[PDB]
Design an enzyme around this catalytic site. Structure first.
Site, mmCIF file in Angstrom:
data_model
loop_
_atom_site.group_PDB
_atom_site.id
_atom_site.type_symbol
_atom_site.label_atom_id
_atom_site.label_comp_id
_atom_site.label_asym_id
_atom_site.label_seq_id
_atom_site.Cartn_x
_atom_site.Cartn_y
_atom_site.Cartn_z
ATOM 1 N N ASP A 192 0.616 -1.378 0.163
ATOM 2 C CA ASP A 192 -0.246 0.133 -0.269
ATOM 3 C C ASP A 192 0.848 1.523 -0.088
ATOM 4 O O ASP A 192 2.137 1.227 0.645
ATOM 5 C CB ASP A 192 -0.671 -0.026 1.750
ATOM 6 C CG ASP A 192 -1.453 1.042 1.405
ATOM 7 O OD1 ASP A 192 -2.072 1.668 0.257
ATOM 8 O OD2 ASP A 192 -2.098 1.812 2.970
ATOM 9 N N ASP A 208 -2.345 5.583 -5.299
ATOM 10 C CA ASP A 208 -1.844 5.111 -3.772
ATOM 11 C C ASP A 208 -3.093 3.526 -4.262
ATOM 12 O O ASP A 208 -3.937 2.371 -4.560
ATOM 13 C CB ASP A 208 -3.341 4.976 -3.067
ATOM 14 C CG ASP A 208 -3.255 4.677 -1.964
ATOM 15 O OD1 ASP A 208 -3.618 3.608 -2.056
ATOM 16 O OD2 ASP A 208 -4.441 5.885 -1.425
HETATM 17 C C1 LIG Z 1 -3.890 4.031 2.384
HETATM 18 N N1 LIG Z 1 -4.079 3.411 1.271
HETATM 19 C C2 LIG Z 1 -5.210 3.165 0.356
HETATM 20 C C3 LIG Z 1 -6.499 2.255 1.745
HETATM 21 C C4 LIG Z 1 -5.447 0.585 1.929
HETATM 22 C C5 LIG Z 1 -6.327 0.093 2.681
HETATM 23 C C6 LIG Z 1 -5.286 -1.627 2.911
HETATM 24 C C7 LIG Z 1 -6.251 -2.596 3.917
HETATM 25 C C8 LIG Z 1 -6.259 -2.026 5.399
HETATM 26 C C9 LIG Z 1 -7.107 -0.656 5.062
HETATM 27 C C10 LIG Z 1 -6.294 0.274 4.291
HETATM 28 N N2 LIG Z 1 -7.799 1.255 1.118
HETATM 29 C C11 LIG Z 1 -8.832 2.280 1.092
HETATM 30 O O1 LIG Z 1 -8.758 2.908 2.075
HETATM 31 N N3 LIG Z 1 -10.018 1.706 0.135
HETATM 32 C C12 LIG Z 1 -11.023 2.318 0.526
HETATM 33 C C13 LIG Z 1 -11.850 1.149 1.388
HETATM 34 C C14 LIG Z 1 -12.147 -0.292 0.826
HETATM 35 C C15 LIG Z 1 -9.840 -0.878 0.738
HETATM 36 C C16 LIG Z 1 -9.959 -2.120 -0.284
HETATM 37 O O2 LIG Z 1 -10.457 -2.215 -1.530
HETATM 38 C C17 LIG Z 1 -8.920 -2.620 -0.423
HETATM 39 C C18 LIG Z 1 -8.095 -3.976 -0.541
HETATM 40 C C19 LIG Z 1 -7.086 -4.134 -1.061
HETATM 41 C C20 LIG Z 1 -6.212 -3.481 -2.132
HETATM 42 O O3 LIG Z 1 -6.796 -3.537 -3.609
HETATM 43 C C21 LIG Z 1 -6.640 -2.823 -4.664
HETATM 44 C C22 LIG Z 1 -10.081 -3.183 0.952
HETATM 45 C C23 LIG Z 1 -11.841 -4.756 0.966
HETATM 46 C C24 LIG Z 1 -11.923 -5.223 1.643
HETATM 47 C C25 LIG Z 1 -11.063 -5.209 2.921
HETATM 48 C C26 LIG Z 1 -10.298 -4.509 3.469
HETATM 49 CL CL1 LIG Z 1 -9.414 -4.170 5.041
HETATM 50 C C27 LIG Z 1 -9.377 -3.503 2.604
HETATM 51 C C28 LIG Z 1 -9.569 0.218 -0.957
#
Ligand SMILES: CNC[C@H](CC1CCCCC1)NC(=O)N1CCC[C@@H]([C@@](O)(CCCCOC)c2cccc(Cl)c2)C1
Ligand SMILES: *[C@@H]1O[C@H](CO)[C@@H](O[C@@H]2O[C@H](CO)[C@@H](O)[C@H](O)[C@H]2NC(C)=O)[C@H](O)[C@H]1NC(C)=O
Ligand SMILES: [Cl-]
Length: 337
Positions: free
Chosen positions: A35, A223
């Site tokens: 990430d 990101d």
């Molecule tokens: C700061 N950077 C962005 C932030 C990172 C995220 C990492 C894991 C713990 C929380 C923060 N992602 C973010 O805000 N997203 C929007 C909400 C769903 C996320 C996400 O789709 C991400 C999936 C993995 C990456 O795919 C491309 C998801 C789905 C289900 C459960 C969780 Cl745990 C997270 C993508």
């Protein structure tokens, strides 16, 4: 050095991309998100109570099974937009690709069902700068650079489209460079606004022909942990209004049958127009006029200092292979393939 390690990534439904790392001696394997929007490493701990369902259904790290484990115990709390985890710091050896680094990371002991009961991965490896690290723990890529094994102080992401086929590489990260097998042409480079965050300036966002949004500049976080492209509510409201899209509880939808003829959306970066077609950003489950199809774009209001900002997530990185260059504080984009 002359080393470039690659890590194979799994693609789950074109919304979650993650790979595998090994922690401890002998190595305990975890599925983690790499990430660029964050800077801490963490995985669920064996000391996490089964009272947390997320810690029943994910891999736990057992410090007492690793001979290289070194106790610290300092409390750590990580608040992401989508939810908070907490635990304590531990040190151990972490392998990523062929590389092996001694890393300080979080053992998580508190892990909320939202969102983590939806996670196909166990933890995260933050690829951001130490400036964003909570507890000022030295980020793993910083520790790898310190080793002096990398051909270049860069890392790169390939995210693939999801394919029913058994082989089919879901995605790839390279530490030390980029894989020309998954991008054509040359990298267009854009300088970071500042060191400390993988963020660049954006001169505008176009829907169709009308340069409609961000008309006078805005920020773009590149990101890799983001699944969709995000903008501010007010930007997204306008964008979705342009597209005729409807706001549901968790997403934005259009009638499937009209998705294909929706306008292009271009992001104006580093003097160039980065375009995604509706084929790039509509999840076309069908083309029926009686069903609704989800857009891989949504609203996320990211607070200062980092926000307000757009985030260029997997929806964008799928089309454009992305190189994060720590030596020159720049990001490179090249067409993916
Ligand atoms: C700061 N950077 C962005 C932030 C990172 C995220 C990492 C894991 C713990 C929380 C923060 N992602 C973010 O805000 N997203 C929007 C909400 C769903 C996320 C996400 O789709 C991400 C999936 C993995 C990456 O795919 C491309 C998801 C789905 C289900 C459960 C969780 Cl745990 C997270 C993508
Ligand atoms: C856990 O990590 C912390 C943070 O690095 C360690 O605390 C530092 O230890 C060094 C070495 O003794 C000191 O010079 C610093 O002043 C400490 N930081 C502060 C202000 O707390 C801590 O020692 C580690 N825990 C253990 C037991 O290894
Ligand atoms: Cl706007």
């Amino acid at each position: 050095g002359n080393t470039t390690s690659s890590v194979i990534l799994t693609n789950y439904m074109d919304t979650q991309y993650y790979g595998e790392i090994g922690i401890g001696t002998p190595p305990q394997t975890f599925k983690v998100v790499f990430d660029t929007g964050s800077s801490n490493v963490w995985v669920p701990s064996s000391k996490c109570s089964r009272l947390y369902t997320a810690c029943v259904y994910h891999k736990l790290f057992d410090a007492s099974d690793s001979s290289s484990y070194k106790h610290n115990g300092t409390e750590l709390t990580l608040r992401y937009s989508t939810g908070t985890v907490s635990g304590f710091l531990s040190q151990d050896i972490i392998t990523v690709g062929g590389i092996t680094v001694t890393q300080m990371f979080g053992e998580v002991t508190e892990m909320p069902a939202l969102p983590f009961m939806l996670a196909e991965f166990d933890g995260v490896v933050g690829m951001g700068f130490i400036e964003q690290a909570i507890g000022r723990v030295t980020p793993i890529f910083d520790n790898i650079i310190s080793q002096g094994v990398l051909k270049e102080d860069v890392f790169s992401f390939y995210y693939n489209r999801d394919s029913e086929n058994s082989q089919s590489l879901g995605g790839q990260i390279v530490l030390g460079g980029s894989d020309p097998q998954h991008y054509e042409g040359n990298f267009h480079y854009i300088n970071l606004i500042k060191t400390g965050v993988w963020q660049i300036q954006m001169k505008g966002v176009s829907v169709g022909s009308s340069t409609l949004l961000c008309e006078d500049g805005c920020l773009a976080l590149v990101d890799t942990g983001a699944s969709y492209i995000s903008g501010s509510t007010s930007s997204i409201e306008k964008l979705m209004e342009a597209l005729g899209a409807k706001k549901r509880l968790f997403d934005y939808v259009v009638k499937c049958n009209e998705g294909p003829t929706l306008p292009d959306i271009s992001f104006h970066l580093g003097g160039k127009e980065y375009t995604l077609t509706s084929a790039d950003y509509v999840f076309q489950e069908s083309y029926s006029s009686k069903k609704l199809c989800t857009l891989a774009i949504h609203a996320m209001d990211i607070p200062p200092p980092t926000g307000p900002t757009w985030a260029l997530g997997a929806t964008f990185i799928r089309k454009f292979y992305t190189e994060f260059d720590r030596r020159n504080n720049r990001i490179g984009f090249a067409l993916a393939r």
